[PDB]
């Protein structure tokens, strides 16, 4: 991310020296290999983000069909005052 | 043996078993060949389990 800003400016400014050099690829092989291995897999993560984004907005729109329902759905309870009226030994007591 | 599917002979060569295909299904018969010591036969549905008849053909 940050360093290829440097490499695009080196090509733009020194566009004459390294077009007059006789073996461009042989002299900066490591750049060619790095960019080839970075951009070679671009169809693969194209297919990955297509398949990923499809399921992502699929559940997003299915859950946005009912996104307001889970805001007040939880009406759960606990051992309420029926437990106090339940404790028959504590009903003989108090 | 008028229809044979599969066959094998014992290590000493003293008897041999084989299959028949004689009707609902196949059959299995063993026979001693160098003597009439034993020769038996039975349908192999009595070999096979009761689970295998409701399962795939590999069973």
């Amino acid at each position: 991310g940050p360093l290829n800003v440097w490499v695009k400016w080196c090509l733009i400014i020194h566009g004459g020296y390294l077009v007059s050099i006789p073996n461009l690829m042989s002299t900066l092989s490591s750049l060619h290999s790095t960019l080839k291995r970075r951009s070679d897999l671009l169809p693969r993560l194209l297919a990955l983000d297509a398949r990923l984004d499809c399921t992502i907005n699929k559940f997003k729109t299915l859950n946005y069909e009912a996104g307001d329902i889970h805001s007040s759905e939880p009406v759960v309870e606990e051992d309420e005052d029926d437990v106090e009226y339940n404790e028959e030994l504590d009903d003989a007591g108090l | 043996w008028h229809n044979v599917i599969l066959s094998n002979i014992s290590s000493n060569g003293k008897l041999l078993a084989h299959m028949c295909k004689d009707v609902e299904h196949k059959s299995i018969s063993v026979v001693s060949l160098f003597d009439d010591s034993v020769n038996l036969s039975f349908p192999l549905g009595s070999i096979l389990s009761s689970q295998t008849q409701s399962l795939s053909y590999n069973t």
Binding site: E77, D82, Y85, N86, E87, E88 | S49
Partner: protein
């Protein structure tokens, strides 16, 4: 309207794990199945069900135990000519013998040494071994009569706890212990070496943990001891010379229980790795060489197998097995690997734990020592009663109008006034010491105030007083199985009741004159009884899955053609109909249900024509609608003229035996 159906899954009534199976009679292949054969199932919450394997395993009685009670072993005893006797150990220092009539302990014999780990019964059944935690084996003299138990002899002690027992004959007693060893004591009275341990054998220990010998049986056709231990290995030991013949490395974890057939051609074995292994010696070469082979292996259970037993007669040859998953499994003995099997439902509610009342749309349900009440609306839990002055619960009923609940166990009963205070209830005890002293099985509410009470000692009171009740002829099966002449059912509405005892006797009773007018008229155990006010009828259904109806003041013509025009669903039914009621909108249609289906028969129509106890053995003597899409079923009822209440069940670590991956 059409039928609107409340498919409720609120009640989480869950049974407990089967820990002990036993058969009442021993095997005797070449004679008929006796009419007195009962299977006994001790669970782990402390209740003992007693099932009869006639016509697909109905459940006759249930003997419940209370809070913090369990049951680990149980053994039958039937000296020929005397009543059945049922002893059981819990996790305690006593043996508990139960009388089968009341469903109570009639004896708590404290064994005089330590906490009992196992129990076994002598061959000829006059003595009882209890193997205890402090290494003792205690003999209890049983033959004094039913109820009276004497101490006999503490056998020669040892260090480690004896976890399983068996007898050779009247002579020797074999015991597997928790130090990986198998001792052999002599219980032969009037010998010089009586009580001292004759032999000790040691199984192949586990490398990285202690070894426990969990199951030991004697095999009388040969002269061996079979033994399963906690490595999974199963060993066969020659009794004389006290030494191993052959060891199999069968299971992957412990072997909790193993059993054999009559002639000892097979040994079945099972444990925590949840497979049942079968070891066979049926070949003539196997019998003349004394060589068991590891014949087969089946995976049928879900979590464990903690109990296994076998029965084998002329019209019955099945091994029965149960474990941590709460269901029972029946397989065939001589056709184990080949034949079929039946996994029973986890509950078949012959005794219900749920009932509804149509007013307030409410339903009560009681598990062990607590009741709970909720209303329909959704649904809302309005009240509950976790009465802990109680220890054990049993049957319960609500007043019509929903005013007073009455809970009742075989020791006492208690009545609670209820007042709906809105989104809650207020519940208050109302004192009555007659109720507080009486034993109750069934309470069924003649009026809003009057109830009828069936006592565990065969008394029929009417409170808020005494129904004359005639006596029954005591035959051999009634003296053998001592609860056959006990009132199972009573159903009542509007001053007319009917009771039912399992000999095939169903007797009406007018609540005014309190006279019987008997209509016994039956052949076997009666599954359910419901009274039709239309037609003036009683409706009995027996264990053979036949519906009879009779009139009151013998069977009607509708019964006379219905019984043999009965549908194919009823003719191939496997689970007995435990509940009948009548429809609410029509007073003449009736709506009934078993544990895996719901049916409804029509009062006038008739339709046109064109692994059990199956022998010639007797019983205990000597528009039509059918659905099953609510099959894990617990209770159904009605509320009003269009809706239905279908309350069912819904679901633990287990030994992973993985399915093949692809």
């Amino acid at each position: 309207e059409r039928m609107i159906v409340h498919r409720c899954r609120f009640v989480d009534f869950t049974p407990a794990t089967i820990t002990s199976l036993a058969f009442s009679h021993k095997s005797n292949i070449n004679k008929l199945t006796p009419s007195d054969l009962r299977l006994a199932i001790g669970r782990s919450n402390g209740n003992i069900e007693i099932w009869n394997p006639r016509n697909n395993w109905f459940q006759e009685m249930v003997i419940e135990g209370g809070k913090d009670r369990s049951i680990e072993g149980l053994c039958w005893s039937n000296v020929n000519g005397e009543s059945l006797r049922l002893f059981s150990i819990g996790g305690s220092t006593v043996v508990t013998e139960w009388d089968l009539a009341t469903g109570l302990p009639l004896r708590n014999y404290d064994c005089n040494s330590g906490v009992i780990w196992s129990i076994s019964i002598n061959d000829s059944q006059d003595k009882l071994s209890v193997g205890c935690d402090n290494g003792t084996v205690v003999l209890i003299d049983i033959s004094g009569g039913p109820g009276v138990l004497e101490h006999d002899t503490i056998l020669m002690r040892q260090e480690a706890r004896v976890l399983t027992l068996a007898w050779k004959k009247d002579d020797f007693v074999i015991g597997g212990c928790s130090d990986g060893r198998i001792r052999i004591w002599s219980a032969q009275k009037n010998d010089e070496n009586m009580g001292r341990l004759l032999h000790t054998m040691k199984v192949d220990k586990a490398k990285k943990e202690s070894t426990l010998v969990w199951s030991v049986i004697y095999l009388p056709r040969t002269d061996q001891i079979a033994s399963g231990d906690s490595t999974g290995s199963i060993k066969f030991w020659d009794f004389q010379f006290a030494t191993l013949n052959q060891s199999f490395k069968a299971h992957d974890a412990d072997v909790l229980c193993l059993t054999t057939d009559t002639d000892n051609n097979y040994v079945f074995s099972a444990g925590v790795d949840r497979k049942i292994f079968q070891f066979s010696q049926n070949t003539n070469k196997s019998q003349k060489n004394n060589r068991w082979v590891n014949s087969s292996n089946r995976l049928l259970h879900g979590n464990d197998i903690r109990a296994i037993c076998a029965y084998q007669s002329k019209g019955a040859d099945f091994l029965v097995s149960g474990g941590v998953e709460k269901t029972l499994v029946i397989n065939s003995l001589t056709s184990f690997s080949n034949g079929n099997y039946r996994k029973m439902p986890t509950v078949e509610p012959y005794s219900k734990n749920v009932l509804v009342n149509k007013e307030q749309r409410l339903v009560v349900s009681w598990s062990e020592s607590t009741v709970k009440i909720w209303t329909m609306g959704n649904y809302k839990l309005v009240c509950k009663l976790t009465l802990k002055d109680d220890q054990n619960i049993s049957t319960c009923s609500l007043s019509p109008d929903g005013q007073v609940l009455v809970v009742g166990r075989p020791s006492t009963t208690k009545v609670f006034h209820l007042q709906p205070v809105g989104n809650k209830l207020k519940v208050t005890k109302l004192d009555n010491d007659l109720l507080l002293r009486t034993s109750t099985k069934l309470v069924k509410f003649i009026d809003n105030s009057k109830i009828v009470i069936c006592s565990c000692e065969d008394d029929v009171f009417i409170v808020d007083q005494e129904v004359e009740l005639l006596e029954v002829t005591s035959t051999k099966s009634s003296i053998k199985v001592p609860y056959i002449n006990r009132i199972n059912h009573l159903e009542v509405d509007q001053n007319i009741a009917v009771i039912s005892r399992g000999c095939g006797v169903v007797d009406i009773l007018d609540l005014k004159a309190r006279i019987s007018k008997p209509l016994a008229r039956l052949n076997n155990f009666i599954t359910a009884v419901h009274i039709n006010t239309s037609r003036k009828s009683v409706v009995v259904i027996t264990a053979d899955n036949k519906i009879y109806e009779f009139n009151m003041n013998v069977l009607t013509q509708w019964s006379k053609n219905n019984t043999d025009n009965l549908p194919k669903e009823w003719k191939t039914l496997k689970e007995n109909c435990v509940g009948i009621f009548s429809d609410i909108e029509n007073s003449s249609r009736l709506w009934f249900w078993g544990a895996t289906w719901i049916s409804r028969i029509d009062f006038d129509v008739d339709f046109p024509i064109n692994l059990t106890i199956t022998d010639e053995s007797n019983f205990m003597n000597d528009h039509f609608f059918f659905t099953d899409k609510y099959k894990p079923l617990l209770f159904v009822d009605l509320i009003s003229s269009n809706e239905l209440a279908i309350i069912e069940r819904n679901p633990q670590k287990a030994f992973i035996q993985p399915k093949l991956v692809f």
